[PDB]
Amino acid sequence: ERNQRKVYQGRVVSDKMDKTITVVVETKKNHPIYGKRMKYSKKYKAHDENNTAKVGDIVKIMETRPLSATKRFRLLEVVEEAV
Amino acid sequence: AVKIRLKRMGSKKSPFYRIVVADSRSPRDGRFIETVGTYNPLKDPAEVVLKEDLVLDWLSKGAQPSDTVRNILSKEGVMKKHHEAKNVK
Amino acid sequence: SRYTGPSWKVSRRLGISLSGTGKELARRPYKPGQHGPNSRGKVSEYGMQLTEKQKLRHMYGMNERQFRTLFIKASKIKEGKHGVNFMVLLEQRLDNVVYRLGLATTRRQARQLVNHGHITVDGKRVDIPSYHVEVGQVIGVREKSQNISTIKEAVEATVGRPAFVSFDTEKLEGSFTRLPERDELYPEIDEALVVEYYNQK
Amino acid sequence: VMTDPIADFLTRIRNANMVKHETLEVPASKIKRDIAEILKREGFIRDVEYIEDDKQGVIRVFLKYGKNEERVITNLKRISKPGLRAYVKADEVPKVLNGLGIAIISTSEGVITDKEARAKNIGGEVIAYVW
Amino acid sequence: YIDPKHLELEDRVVAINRVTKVVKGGRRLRFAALVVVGDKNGHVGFGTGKAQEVPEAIRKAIEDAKKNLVEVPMVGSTIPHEVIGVFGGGRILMKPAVEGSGVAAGGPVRAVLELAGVADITSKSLGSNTPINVVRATVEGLKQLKRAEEVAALRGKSVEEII
Amino acid sequence: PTINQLVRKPRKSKVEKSDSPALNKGYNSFKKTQTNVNSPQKRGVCTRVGTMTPKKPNSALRKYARVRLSNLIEVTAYIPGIGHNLQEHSVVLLRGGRVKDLPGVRYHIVRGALDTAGVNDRKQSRSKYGTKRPKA
RNA sequence: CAGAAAGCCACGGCUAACUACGUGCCAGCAGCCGCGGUAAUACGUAGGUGGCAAGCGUUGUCCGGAUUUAUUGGGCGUAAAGCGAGCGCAGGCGGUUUCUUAAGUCUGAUGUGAAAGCCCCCGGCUCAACCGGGGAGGGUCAUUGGAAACUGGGAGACUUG
RNA sequence: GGUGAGGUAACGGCUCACCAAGGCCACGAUGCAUAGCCGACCUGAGAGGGUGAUCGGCCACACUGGGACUGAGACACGGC
């Protein structure tokens, strides 16, 4: 033990699946020719115990091991809740 | 199965040779792990250009120096120093 | 084509005596061809830099591509003018040591001498005419058979002998003394007509 | 709608200078005050002074001129306009007119000249040139 | 201003045209000439004129040329900094070079800058290439040039805290 | 344009042609293949012979050689040299070069490297027209 | 024993090199402009000259010259180029100010970016290439610590838009 | 995606049975054409364009397509 996983504090988008939500991180980087800052994202399939976080919730996530057809994320901390 | 060995750098008539240290799965002048020494193939008494720092470090891991390495490093006594500082250790 | 010229028509066409006022002056200032005196309009700076670079190339008889690569060696120094340091490094050929010591009378005599192993340096033989002689190599004369008369025939004919090398004809021994410069080693030829031609050749 | 008032300040400088009179009033903020003090440092503005009632600014600009009516400043333009912010590291610091003008860098401790940045090895974002 | 005709100067004729004007019947033909005159020490100028033959034309051009001469403020036979000049399509880039490298510039702009006593400079023609506007934009760009004592004199500070 | 409008367009280039179309050979045998064959020169055969007169205002009778290569396409090509050593239904090599005499022709056949001979007048340009050193 | 050791394409301009004659709307030269057509430095001979140089012409392909895809580095009154005009989803950019934050940004330390590569320092092959020793280059990289001006996130304020 | 079991050097719908209908996309999913990738290069002032030979590293292939066995290591270039 000397290394954890790179936690990605994304927000929750979908939670329709059992034990499984959808966490979307967001970052912004340059253009390979011009200069200004773009905006882009991926989607991270996250495994929950009983689908705690609602739509729009903020949670940091941490990878464990291939659990399914390549979902590789776990819940850590429900940071702040939508209402 | 690590193994220290030699390596050629010839031209047409006049070669130049180099010792090289590797693992025995690899080809000879192909890949390796690190570097040890060289020697002149011409102008006897030629240029014994040796590192003499990684041979005993490398055989502490345990390897098999080849036929030429044993003779030309018994000229520097490294194999003599091998069984002198390892069989006495 | 390495060297053919009889040192008449090249000194006629370029114009400067090539290079120590050793002239042939009854037919010099009018150029060859079927119009000797009946000349024509002025020269483009194409032709000006053309005959200028051919003037410095015929300081030796050497090669244009070798002049190129030697010119590119002159940029590594990073002090002084690039034309001046080239002009200095123009003058450390082994043949330049032959002519400026006093062992011969011309560069073709220098190259015909040094071709057949007739000189050495520092007790070791050098075969090639274009060895890079630094300051310290005490140039020699291969003292096996130095009683050949044409060596001292060129020595005792004391026509052109510069004063920047320390040398004694008693031993036929000496060394290239110190650094030359522009104001001492052969005015008048160039400082910039090399450094402008060699950008868009 | 003005979406960048710094460039409007710089163009009011050039518009008042190009017809050569030394009175100028622009509504101002903290950073216009910073470039006003920078331009008073390096010998380009004769005087700056501040008048506030209940609103923006204002900082009054008093231009600088020579003996035979000529101009000591001759142009002025920005670098990191909105839309394309542009950032400069400590071995990227520009040197305009071979250092005969100046350039502005916003480092992590204020608005400084670009001799100050190579005097501290600290880079930042470049606002504008002037010469 | 009136720089006098009392300095040792040198010429170079850049280019000539042959220029018509139709008369009823035949055709007129007259020549022009574009001549620069310089001291190769730091005073250069140019001018033109037209006549019916070549030596008369270049005589009138040299007659015109010495009315106008420019200072060209040098430092170490090189520019102080980088200056760009434009006069009607004639974009000309000019930039200080490394000492001992020469002039890297084209046809007409070399005939100015060599004659004005510049050892080391770089340039690049850009835009128009008729020889008139090249020379005019050249002299316009050389006009656009400062010097350290001048600039430190213009500001309230002194030199050598800014070099 | 403004820079995000330069982001969401790529600024395409000006993709160039080449006036040697026959030297990129999309074969017939066996299975009607493609071109990888950036050649200096391609050899071919004859299909007819004749001459040609140019446009206004040049006036003579130039001769030519219309050639079919191995790719079943036919180009007209020009003849260099004095004395055409080639004849009807003969093997011919080609060299590339545009010619401004007429529409249609953009090549010139070889002289003095293959089946054709070369020059027997010129003793001064002997590398051209493929007939070097005569002792005379 | 100076004996065995010399070859290439043009010369109307761009781009150094001239003569005599022939075919004289034609035989044929053209990289492009462009020649011819009885007085051709352009068709062809013959001599004169020119530039590389045991290597030198032709042909094809790749980058430049090209600011002729312009971020560095172009502009749309008449030249090629503002949709016929409005309304608005998403998107791009946003008035002044207090406190916080530190995502962007600047800065240190550390591990790595194979060796031969190119360059530079040093050296040997008679020099030279070739080979040898030592570090700079290739991160838009990963961890870790600060900086808090500008952009970005959170709480309040103001009246000019 | 969840449930459990089989199976695997090893996790896993890799595979079986049950419960739901979830997943990916205008930042380009899917489709069509061309190409082995890299360290590197006798181009450029530089930003960047062109080529992937040497020589070195990685991947894949053995007249075409399937399939295993021995052997720890192969679904094996001169093994079946």
Size of interface D-E (CB pairs under 8 A): 26
Residue C182 at interface with chain E, using a CB cutoff of 8 Å: no
CB-strand contact A40/H, under 7 Å: yes
Interface contact A35-D86, CB threshold 8 A: yes
Whether residue D102 sits in one domain with residue D47: no
Structure tokens at C89: 């490094």
Indicate if D69 and D82 belong to the same structural domain: no
**CA separation (Å) from A40 to A6, A43, A72, F9, F41?**
19, 11, 20, 18, 52
Query: Of C80, C84, C192, which has the smallest distance from its Cβ to E102's Cβ?
Result: C192
Name the closest nucleotide to C3, judged by C1' and CA.
G53
Which residue type is seen at C62? M
Does D contact C via 3+ CB–CB distances below 8 Å?
A: no
The verdict on C44 touching E (C-beta cutoff 8 Å) is: no
C102 SS3 class: coil
* D76 CA, G72 C1': Å apart: 20
The answer to whether some atom of strand H lies closer than 7 Å to the beta carbon of A54 is no
Give every CB contact of residue B65 below 8 A, 6+ residues apart in sequence: B3, B4, B55, B59, B73, B79
Chain F contact set for D84 (CB, 8 A): 3
Q: Which nucleotide is nearest to A42 (CA to C1')?
A: H27
Regarding whether D78 and D68 lie in a shared domain, the answer is no
Range of the domain at F119: 1-136
Nearby residues of B9 by Cβ (< 8 Å), 6 or more positions away: B15, B16, B17, B18
Judge whether D68 and D80 are in contact, CB under 8 Å. Answer: no
Touching subunits of B (3+ CB pairs, under 8 Å) are none
CA distance F54 to chain A (A): 51
* CA–C1' nearest nucleotide, residue A64: H11
Residue C83: which residues within 8 A CB-CB, separation 6 or more?
C190, C191, C192, C194, C195, E100
Q: Which of E80, E81, E155 sits opposite D43 (nearest CB)?
A: E155
Per the structure, how many domains does chain F have?
1
Question: In the listed set D49, D73, D97, which residue is the last one of a domain according to the structure?
Answer: D73
**Structure determined by:** cryo-EM
In chain F, positions 7-66, which contact chain A (CB-CB < 8 Å)?
7
Nucleotide nearest to A65 (CA to C1'): H11
CA atoms within 13 A on the CB side of D55: 3
Q: Are residues D80 and D106 in the same domain?
A: yes
E40-67: buried (b, 16+ CB within 10 Å) or exposed (e) per residue? Answer: eebbbbbbbbebeeeeebbebbbebbbe
Quick one: D64 and D94 in the same domain? no
CA distances from A30 to A33, C64, D85, E85, F10 (A): 9, 50, 11, 35, 16
Cα–Cα distance measured from residue C87 to residue C185, given in angstroms and rounded to the nearest whole number: 9
Residues D57 and D108 in one domain: no
- Domain-terminating residue out of D73, D92, D111: D73
The answer to whether A17 CB is within 7 Å of strand H is yes
Which of D44, D70, D99 minimises the CB distance to E163?
D99
Judge whether residue A41 contacts strand H, using its CB and a 7 Å cut-off.
Answer: yes
State the CB neighbour count (10 A cutoff) for residue F93. 19
Helices (H), chain E: 54-65, 108-113, 131-142, 148-154
Q: How far is CA A8 from CA A38, C6, E5, in A?
A: 19, 85, 80
- Which residues 2-21 in chain F show a CB within 8 A of chain D? 2-4
**Shortest CB distance from E81 goes to which of D70, D72, D100?**
D100
Resolution (A): 3.5
Q: Rounded to whole angstroms, how far apart are CA atoms E25 and B66?
A: 104
- The whole-angstrom distance between E162's CA and the closest CA on chain C is 26
D13 is in which domain, residue-wise?
1-73
Contact E40, E117 (CB under 8 A): yes
D42: its two tokens:
């390096």
Domain boundary among D25, D55, D73: D73
Based on the fold, state whether residues D21 and D39 are members of the same structural domain. yes
Chain E interface, best mutation among C42, C49, C79, C81, by max E CB count within 10 A: C81
Looking at strand G, which nucleotides approach a protein CB closer than 7 A?
A: 6-11, 14-18, 25-36, 44-54, 56-62, 66-71, 74-76, 91-98, 103-108, 114, 119-121, 125-133, 140, 142-143, 146-151, 159-161
CB of D84 less than 8 A from some CB of A: yes
Q: How many CA atoms lie within 13 A of B31 on its CB side?
A: 5
Domain boundaries, chain B: 1-89
Residue type, C177: T
C-alpha span between C98 and C134 (Å, rounded): 14
Neighbours of B33 (CB within 10 A): 12
- What is the spatial distance between Cα D55 and Cα A36, in angstroms, rounded to a whole number? 34
- Please state, as a whole number, how many other Cβ atoms lie within 10 Å of the Cβ of residue B86: 11
How far, in Å, CA of E46 to CA of E69, rounded? Answer: 8
Angstrom distances, CA of residue A5 to CA of A74, B30, C81, E3: 11, 37, 60, 79
Q: In one letter, which amino acid is C66?
A: Q
> Within 10 Å of residue E19's Cβ, how many Cβ atoms?
11
Give Cα separations from C13 to C45, C52, C58, C188, E141 (angstroms). Answer: 16, 11, 12, 17, 41
List the structure tokens of D87. 């950032």
DSSP string, C183-198: TTS--SS-SSTTTTTT
Residues of A in contact with F10 (CB under 8 A): none
Kindly give the residue spans of alpha helices, DSSP state H, lying in chain D: 5-18, 30-41, 114-118
- Find the residue closest to H3 using CA and C1' atoms: A18
- Testing the interface with D: which of E158, E162, E163 to mutate, by most D Cβ within 10 A? E162
Rounded to whole angstroms, the Cα distance separating F81 from C191 reads 49
Q: If you classify domain E10-67 with CATH, what class do you get? A: alpha beta
Phi, psi of C131 (to 5 degrees): -70, 145
Return d(Cα F61, Cα F54) in angstroms, integer: 8
Count up the domains in chain D and report the number. 2
